[PDB]
Design a protein around this motif. Structure first.
Motif, PDB file in Angstrom:
ATOM      1  N   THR A   1       0.860  -1.214   0.000  1.00  0.00           N
ATOM      2  CA  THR A   1       0.000   0.000   0.000  1.00  0.00           C
ATOM      3  C   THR A   1       0.891   1.257   0.000  1.00  0.00           C
TER       4      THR A   1
ATOM      5  N   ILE B   1       3.276   2.783  -5.594  1.00  0.00           N
ATOM      6  CA  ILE B   1       2.372   2.751  -6.774  1.00  0.00           C
ATOM      7  C   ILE B   1       2.705   1.503  -7.563  1.00  0.00           C
TER       8      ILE B   1
ATOM      9  N   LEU C   1      -1.268   2.826 -14.059  1.00  0.00           N
ATOM     10  CA  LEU C   1      -0.873   2.582 -12.652  1.00  0.00           C
ATOM     11  C   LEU C   1      -2.115   2.515 -11.769  1.00  0.00           C
TER      12      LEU C   1
ATOM     13  N   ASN D   1      -2.814   3.244  -7.409  1.00  0.00           N
ATOM     14  CA  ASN D   1      -2.391   3.490  -6.001  1.00  0.00           C
ATOM     15  C   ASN D   1      -3.058   2.409  -5.159  1.00  0.00           C
TER      16      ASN D   1
ATOM     17  N   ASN E   1      -3.242   1.855  -2.131  1.00  0.00           N
ATOM     18  CA  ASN E   1      -3.775   2.404  -0.865  1.00  0.00           C
ATOM     19  C   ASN E   1      -5.087   3.129  -1.128  1.00  0.00           C
ATOM     20  N   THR E   2      -5.204   3.850  -2.237  1.00  0.00           N
ATOM     21  CA  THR E   2      -6.390   4.684  -2.543  1.00  0.00           C
ATOM     22  C   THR E   2      -7.268   4.017  -3.596  1.00  0.00           C
TER      23      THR E   2
ATOM     24  N   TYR F   1      -6.724   4.546  -6.642  1.00  0.00           N
ATOM     25  CA  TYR F   1      -6.598   5.566  -7.717  1.00  0.00           C
ATOM     26  C   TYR F   1      -5.914   4.892  -8.899  1.00  0.00           C
TER      27      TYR F   1
ATOM     28  N   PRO G   1       6.516   8.139  -1.855  1.00  0.00           N
ATOM     29  CA  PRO G   1       6.113   7.008  -2.680  1.00  0.00           C
ATOM     30  C   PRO G   1       4.628   6.660  -2.755  1.00  0.00           C
TER      31      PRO G   1
ATOM     32  N   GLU H   1      -2.188  11.874  -8.974  1.00  0.00           N
ATOM     33  CA  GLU H   1      -2.836  12.252  -7.700  1.00  0.00           C
ATOM     34  C   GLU H   1      -2.251  13.587  -7.237  1.00  0.00           C
TER      35      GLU H   1
END
Ligand SMILES: [Ca+2]
Ligand SMILES: [Ca+2]
Ligand SMILES: [Ca+2]
Ligand SMILES: [Tl+]
Ligand SMILES: [Tl+]
Ligand SMILES: [Tl+]
Ligand SMILES: [Tl+]
Ligand SMILES: [Tl+]
Ligand SMILES: [Tl+]
Ligand SMILES: [Tl+]
Ligand SMILES: [Tl+]
Lengths: 210, 211, 255, 253, 211, 211
Positions: A30, A33, A50, A52, A54-55, A57, C50, C56
């Motif tokens: 997490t 990326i 890509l 994310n 964790n999000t 995204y 990171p 974002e």
């Protein structure tokens, strides 16, 4: 040590969709990326998109907007890529790779084959014809990759080349050459052992002089 | 959308040679990264942020450059340095790479050991006729293969397969295979496989008669 | 005049194109550098953090940018631009047509009211200006007369003395409404003399960019100061009205 | 005049203080909205990105603000000192509109702007009087024929003059106010309210700079982006007359 | 299972400095901010400062700007706090806790005792005087904490209160009460046992009725 | 810099009872977080972002509020919910906490068992004289303890130590220790410990005379 372990190679029918998988370990999934990269024989390494982890995204390369769906499972620290309405243009090696500026850790890669072809065993045929003699095995009309050719059950190891497979009319064909001193052949037996794990095939051919 | 240009696409270095591969950016880029890839394996981050070496990249490798021109350099070429080097960039979404620079090992010129093989009995009975030519352990990679059926050239139903540079002797080897219906095969008598290599101005020809 | 208007129109276009080339030449190098500095900041942030994707961090900057654009301050994490003092001053910026805009209307009611407040306010103020103009002209000409008479007392010609008075008028006005304010603001706002002149002229031309505004400073406990200046604006605009009309007539003479 | 000016001055002061009360009433409630929005973004971001301290996000916002202050633009052309945007900027000087949506950063830029505006505003002022009369006479020539239809219904001609002049500043209004508001509604993604606010703020030469057409050619209709200076120039002439008529009426009453 | 393992309690002389450690496991040390929080009984929780273990960025509470230095060791995944020129007011519990908006995981805490006091064993004084009778132990003038107090070697554990120790002039003092049926005492012998592990002293005092 | 205030500092509930504890902020904040703490343990993230429950937190707990006023509520109080709760915010640096509201179990009022002990002979030979009062097993917590030497009240050289609410009987207990010189102790004769508790209008008084 950071490690990206992808799921194994995938063969799907034209039109079908395919999902691969990348389990990370040695760091926190997490924290960084996850990207996916496409590598075919004829083009540049291509960034697909890509996520994310964790999000959740995601952004995609415009070229792959419709093709690819990136997702993660935070609990299993596994990233997923899904490819839709597959054409032979999607047959490639796909990597997952970690990074937000440079791709610092990569998976081992996974080979996607888009094909209507059905597991077919090979028709192994010997190639018989100086101090050094060169003999061969034609291994043709098999699917899917791979086969292995060994010579005298791995005794003859030096003097040995197996060529890359090629598509001969929607199935694979490869040849293997062994070079041994003209003293040993046909004085002694040289047989090429051939395994096609997909078809559970394991066939031996004696090279017989014309 | 930024384009990175690696030329030449392929290059060769004798061990101890200084090597420099360049990467050209369509528009100005802050940092260039580089990846080494040996066949069968994934690409490994080699240099990042233009001039930073990755975990275990030996110091004989350097990166450099700025603006629209970046360069990866090997002070002294080693055997294990032979691989494909890619430059990538992320100063602008989406990130992009070069088409790659394959770096082969230079070695003494070598003529192809050529062999020709007539369709085996077994294959004929199944109605197919594959004529196989092995052009083995030659250097450089530059080679031309031509097939002749009764002394007239044939360029259809021929599939070619090259190996990577041999990890041990630095030679190349290729396979040309002429695949015919048993009918077209049995019509003609002389099968010849003609190889044009740098190492001779006069082609290497191997051949057989069906007789 | 139809041929001369096409000539005059073409001259104005050239004037704009010549302005455009000069402005680009002077301003664009720094604009390009700001852009490069913004980029250098993102690339450093990605390298540090990171868990942040290029795209974002892209949204963050866009959303920060929009909020700063609506007058948010980077320095603080709090939570008056519309205190009776500044609200009066804002109304002032409308009717004068100066319109600094350094604080923006956020409500649909605020904007709709501003449409009518301006449509009625600007011409109303126009009338007052003409009034103050006529009064100011009469006042200085009467006053200039006494020291004008001292030149006549030393036997100098009458047609010479009108032009001397005309020139003398320009000097008096500048001291009172150009140079004094520039020196005043230089001290009060902690600007350079050139920043102050730039403000003064940009103000009295009624352009009102709003990059420089006297009193606006959040720190200053000087609300009475800000309207005081608006009396300078009232007096100043009339002076500059004369100057603008006269240099226009100079352009007529050259034409 | 003595009574007039001090009475008129007091009336204007009253008008300002009454304007002030109205604005404060409507706008003081929402003073902190942008600060609230920045806060919502910072916290939402810290929540999404645990490897970021509140203090680290802090520096980022300052460093971003200074970039934007230099005239950087969030990118996800777009140069405001490219020849097109610079043309338009010069335009905002001589027109006295002065949006300031893009500000001068260099001391040289400001110094030149002074002499430019000083020799530029009057030059434009001259042409405006020119284009005002020229269009005035041309529309008046149009007005006379319209006056003929009213005249051939035996309407008293002085009423036709007013009725035609009323029609004058209504056909002009449709041409220069409504069209742009509709155009901008579509083109800028503004509400028709935001568009009229922009239009009138523009044509009054107040030029706040909260709303700007931009005269920056982008794609699909780049031609129209600089052209709107055409509408401004033509519009300012119509609005000049509208301003004088309203002013003249106020003088009368 | 996320876990912050703080180092053992610290006894330091006034004016000396102290460094305490907090070793994470069960997440990525570098992916999350480490804060330090001071808990002293007579006040609320005080945030001391944070370090971004990844970047090394350190922001402090104004009150601790001079006092505290936050560092990390990314290799050992360990956060450090250093406190300098220790005064009596610094004696507290210190937590390392993770977070950049809420503190979501906390270490077990580390107790800090600033004191001139050298290891001193406790004086144990017996407290002798309805169906019940209450006896007692005064355990005073000892340093440092802790002292275990039992009664008849813990065989008598019900109707016991041991009171919190209190620092009076760099020395701790506590008392224990035991309430036993008055049939029990002085019929049966009741001895309070006090151990001070720091000074490896075990004292046994028998509660005897006054004459 | 932002100040968080929790009134009341102490509050009590029987199981099944609704509890509401409040946190008021000096200046508005977008979110309040809350921690539960029990003797001997680190704070635990209980509720965060105003109304979000943490991993283990049972659903009886809820949070709410906005601006300068926030509140943590227990719909139905359980025994395990007796602990100190802290509110903390991170809408402005530095993050800050409240003083903490202690939550105690309610029970039937209980009279303090009061006992006074003279200085031991042991202590007197060292020249110290500690007169100890145990006020044991009482509820509610609020108790006032006054020392009188030959009638005259004395509050200098008095140390008080409370236990935390007994997890078994929900009572509190405290020790009050008048420490004198042997000299001051030997000058006077009558020493009294007087306890002022809700359980009586008439103070609870134990005493002894030196002879
Ligand atoms: Ca699959
Ligand atoms: Ca820009
Ligand atoms: Ca532009
Ligand atoms: Tl602005
Ligand atoms: Tl100054
Ligand atoms: Tl303006
Ligand atoms: Tl303006
Ligand atoms: Tl403006
Ligand atoms: Tl719209
Ligand atoms: Tl204006
Ligand atoms: Tl005007």
């Amino acid at each position: 040590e950071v490690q990206l372990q992808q799921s194994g190679p995938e063969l799907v029918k034209p039109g079908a969709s395919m999902k691969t998988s990348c389990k990370v370990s040695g760091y926190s999934f997490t924290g960084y990326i996850m990207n996916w990269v496409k590598q075919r024989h004829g083009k540049n390494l291509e960034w697909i998109g890509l996520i994310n982890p964790n999000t959740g995204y995601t952004t995609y390369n415009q070229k792959f907007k419709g093709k690819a769906t990136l997702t993660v499972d935070k609990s299993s620290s596994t990233a997923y890529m899904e490819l839709l309405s597959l054409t032979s243009e999607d047959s490639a090696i796909y990597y997952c790779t970690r990074g937000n500026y440079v791709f610092d850790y990569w998976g081992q890669g996974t080979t996607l084959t888009v094909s209507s072809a059905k597991t077919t065993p090979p028709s192994v045929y010997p190639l018989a014809p100086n101090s050094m003699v060169t003999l061969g095995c034609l291994v043709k009309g098999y699917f899917p990759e791979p086969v292995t050719v060994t010579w005298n059950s791995g005794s003859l190891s030096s003097g040995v080349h197996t060529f890359p497979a090629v598509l001969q009319s929607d199935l694979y064909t490869l040849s293997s050459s062994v070079t041994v001193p003209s003293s040993s052949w046909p004085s002694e037996t040289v047989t090429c052992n051939v395994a096609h794990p997909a078809s559970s095939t394991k066939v031996d051919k004696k090279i017989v002089p014309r | 959308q930024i384009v990175l240009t690696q030329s030449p696409a392929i290059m060769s270095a004798s061990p101890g040679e200084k090597v420099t591969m360049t990467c050209s950016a369509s528009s100005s880029v802050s940092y260039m990264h580089w990846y080494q890839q040996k066949s069968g394996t994934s690409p490994k981050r080699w240099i990042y942020d233009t001039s930073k070496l990755a975990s275990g990249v030996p110091a004989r490798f350097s990166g450099s450059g700025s603006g629209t021109s970046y360069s990866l350099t090997i002070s002294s070429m080693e055997a294990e340095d032979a691989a494909t080097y890619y430059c990538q960039q992320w100063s602008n979404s989406p990130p992009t790479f070069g088409a790659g620079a394959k770096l082969e090992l230079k070695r003494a010129d070598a003529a192809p050991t050529v062999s020709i093989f007539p369709p085996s009995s077994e294959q004929l009975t199944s109605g197919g006729a594959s004529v196989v030519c092995f052009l083995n352990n030659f250097y450089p990679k530059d080679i031309n293969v031509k097939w002749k059926i009764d002394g007239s050239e044939r360029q259809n139903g021929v599939l070619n397969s090259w190996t990577d540079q041999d990890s041990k002797d630095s030679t190349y080897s290729m396979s040309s295979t002429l695949t015919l219906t048993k009918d077209e095969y049995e019509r003609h008598n002389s099968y010849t496989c003609e190889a044009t290599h740098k190492t001779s101005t006069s082609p290497i020809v191997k051949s057989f008669n069906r007789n | 005049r139809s041929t001369t208007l096409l000539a005059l129109l073409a001259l104005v276009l050239l004037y704009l194109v010549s302005g455009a080339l000069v402005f680009r030449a002077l301003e664009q190098p720094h604009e390009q550098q700001a852009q490069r500095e913004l980029g250098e900041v993102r690339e450093k942030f990605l390298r540090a953090h990171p868990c942040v994707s290029d795209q974002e961090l892209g949204l963050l900057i866009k959303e920060v940018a929009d909020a700063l654009g609506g007058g948010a301050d980077p320095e603080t994490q709090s939570t008056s631009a519309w205190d009776l003092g500044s609200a009066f001053f804002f109304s002032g910026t409308i009717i004068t047509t100066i319109g600094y805009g350094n604080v923006a209307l956020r409500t649909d009611a605020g904007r709709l009211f501003c449409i009518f407040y301006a449509l009625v306010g600007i011409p109303l103020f126009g009338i007052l200006l003409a009034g103050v103009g006529d009064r100011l002209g009469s006042s200085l000409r009467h006053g200039i007369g006494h020291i004008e008479a001292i030149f006549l007392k030393w036997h100098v010609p009458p047609e010479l003395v009108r032009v001397l008075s005309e020139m003398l008028f320009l000097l008096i006005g500048c001291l009172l409404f150009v140079l004094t304010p520039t020196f005043v603001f230089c001290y009060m706002e902690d600007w350079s003399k050139l920043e102050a002149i730039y403000f003064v002229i940009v103000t009295l031309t009624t352009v009102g960019f709003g990059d420089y505004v006297a009193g606006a400073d959040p720190r200053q406990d000087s609300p009475a100061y800000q309207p005081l200046v608006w009396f300078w604006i009232l007096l100043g605009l009339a002076y500059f009205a004369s100057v603008l009309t006269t240099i226009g007539n100079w352009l007529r003479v050259v034409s």
